Amino acid sequence: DYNLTEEQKAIKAKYPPVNRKYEYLDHTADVQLHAWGDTLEEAFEQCAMAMFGYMTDTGTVEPLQTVEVETQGDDLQSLLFHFLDEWLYKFSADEFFIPREVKVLSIDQRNFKLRSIGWGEEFSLSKHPQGTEVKAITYSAMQVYNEENPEVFVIIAIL
Amino acid sequence: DYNLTEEQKAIKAKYPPVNRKYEYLDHTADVQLHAWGDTLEEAFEQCAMAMFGYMTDTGTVEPLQTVEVETQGDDLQSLLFHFLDEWLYKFSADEFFIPREVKVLSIDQRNFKLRSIGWGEEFSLSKHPQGTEVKAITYSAMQVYNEENPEVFVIIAIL
Fold first, then answer.
1. Sheet holding B113-122, edge to edge
2. Nearest to B60 among A8, A21, A49 (CB)
3. d(CA A157, CA A116)
4. Interchain CB distance below 8 Å, A57 and B26
5. From CA A130, how far away is CA A54, in angstroms rounded?
6. Angle at B125 between CA B57 and CA B52, to 5 degrees
7. Phi, psi angles (nearest 5°) of residue A74
8. Considering Cα of B91, then B96, then B102, then B107, what sign does the dihedral take?
9. What contacts A123, CB < 8 A, 6 or more positions away?
10. N or C: which end of chain B has fewer CB atoms below 10 A?
């Protein structure tokens, strides 16, 4: 598993090698995004930007293309999940798109519908810094504080 | 956070900075141990060795001191728990002891009491490869099969 000095190496040869009957399985990992704004709409776009920030320095993304994402939900929590899930999909399939910025144009609170756009380009390792892969969005500990100064809390799965 | 190409730093400064309203919190992760042996006594000691195995190359550790761990629990599931939890404390406190190798000498299956011992030295990053820190032992998905061929799985919380 490890990378060791020739000194560390020498020690290994100096002792009887220690028989091993184990294995490591299902390594998992996550982080919690907290994002906030003047309006609820901003609090979603910021949270989408937060996620993408963990994948790269989004400040090094040119705003060449423009993508919409429109989605529906049962409640706000439901909404914010599919919102982040569709964006994540754009990165991970088809054009492998990375927005520099995401902007939620509209959110409907009676019927839990949302319109948004992001301007960026396709992701490249050559052009863009590397950061953590995002595995998936999970509902655990999700919170949508719809009030004066909205806030949003979301846990995702990372490599 | 990010450290950038001279290109990247240029592209970054060519456009208006995006404004961020977010932060990253509570990074967390876990891995699952699977250890087995001819006897339950062995499954247990192989489990410890896996745990220390994640923290560094346990082969680079020299057998220069000897230490004892005794604990017991209510059931086998908790006997396992305290056993790894004790061993962990040994390492994460006081003399920061890491065992090369660990022997479970006895298990009392009527009364759930264990005697073990291990040989190693104080931990030191001068001497020892850095693996991952072990935050906790969790009862998550913990299974202990006392069968024809004993095996156990335990989920620990890493760094």
1. B65-72, B113-122, B97-108
2. A8
3. 23
4. no
5. 9
6. 35
7. -80, -55
8. negative
9. A55, A56, A91, A96, A97, A98
10. N
Which run of H or of E encompasses A143? strand A134-145
Q: How far is CA A100 from CA A65, A85, A123, B18, B142, in A?
A: 10, 17, 10, 8, 43
Query: A139: buried, middle or exposed (CB in 10 Å: 19+, 13-18, 0-12)?
Result: exposed
Rounded-to-integer distance, Cα B17 and Cα B1, Å: 15
Alpha carbon distance A140, B68 (integer Å): 40
Q: What share of chain A is helix, strand, coil (3-state, %, to 5)?
A: 30, 40, 30
Residue A139 — φ and ψ, nearest 5°?
Answer: -75, -5
Q: Under a CB-based contact definition with an 8 Å cutoff, are residues B97 and B91 in contact?
A: yes
Question: Would you call A15 an interface residue with chain B, using a CB distance cutoff of 8 Å?
Answer: yes
Strands A134-145 and B151-158: unpaired
Cα-based angle A87, A91, A94 (whole degrees, multiple of 5)? 110
- Method used to obtain the model: X-ray
Q: Show which of residues 83-112 on chain B sit within 8 Å of chain A, judged by CB atoms.
A: 100-101
Beta bridge partners of A23: B34
- A111 vs B144: CA distance, rounded Å: 49
Q: A13 — contact with chain B (CB < 8 Å)?
A: no
Radius of gyration of chain B (CA): 21
Resolution given for this structure, in angstroms: 3.4
For A113, residues 6+ apart whose C-beta sits below 8 A from its C-beta are: A70, A71, A72, A73, A107
Tokens 């320095």, located at residue: A57
With contact defined as beta carbons under 8 Å apart, do A72 and A139 qualify?
no
Query: For B110, which DSSP code?
Result: T
Q: Which one of B22, B31, B129 has the shortest CB-CB distance to A34? A: B22
Structure-block tokens of residue A121: 């380009």
